[PDB]
Q: What sequence folds into this?
């Protein structure tokens, strides 16, 4: 017959784990009210940054759009952008505004 | 030093009466290069290459 009390601790879910790194180098424009300890939620703004890594290729796109290049020539420069690291969501804001994206 | 090459390039386009669309583009290549928006305003205000 047994009856023992084992000590235990409450901890964070390590399957609910996320480290947010910047896709490419750049400088910080501004940072939101948020410090270690705070409870954030999916969608919460972390910081605004400027990245000039993809800018050159974004022009190579807008250019392609003024001379109406091939659809396959456009998918190219485009998929090279997602490969470079530029976020699928931020890309939609390149095609939509037809202006380069920096911050 | 980094920003100097592009600053001079801007100053000579001010000499060769370049277009606004051409000059503005070089000011933008600076903001992305990391130069302070104020230190840029100081450039245009004196047409002088900022070094320190």
A:
């Amino acid at each position: 017959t047994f009856a023992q009390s084992f000590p235990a601790n409450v901890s964070y879910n390590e399957y609910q784990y996320a480290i947010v790194q910047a896709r490419a180098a750049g400088f910080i424009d501004k940072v939101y009210p948020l410090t270690v300890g705070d409870k954030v939620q999916k969608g919460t703004p972390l910081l605004d940054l400027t990245i000039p890594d993809w800018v050159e290729a974004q022009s190579e796109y807008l250019l392609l759009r003024e001379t109406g290049g091939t659809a396959t020539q456009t998918e190219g420069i485009l998929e090279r952008l997602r490969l470079a690291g530029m976020p699928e969501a931020d890309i939609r804001r390149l095609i939509a505004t037809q202006k380069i994206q920096t911050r």
User: Anything to note?
Assistant: Chain B touches chain A at residues 31-34 (CB under 8 Å). The domain at 1-50 of chain B is CATH 6.10.140.730 (Helix Hairpins). Residues 4-15 of chain B form the longest helix (12 residues).
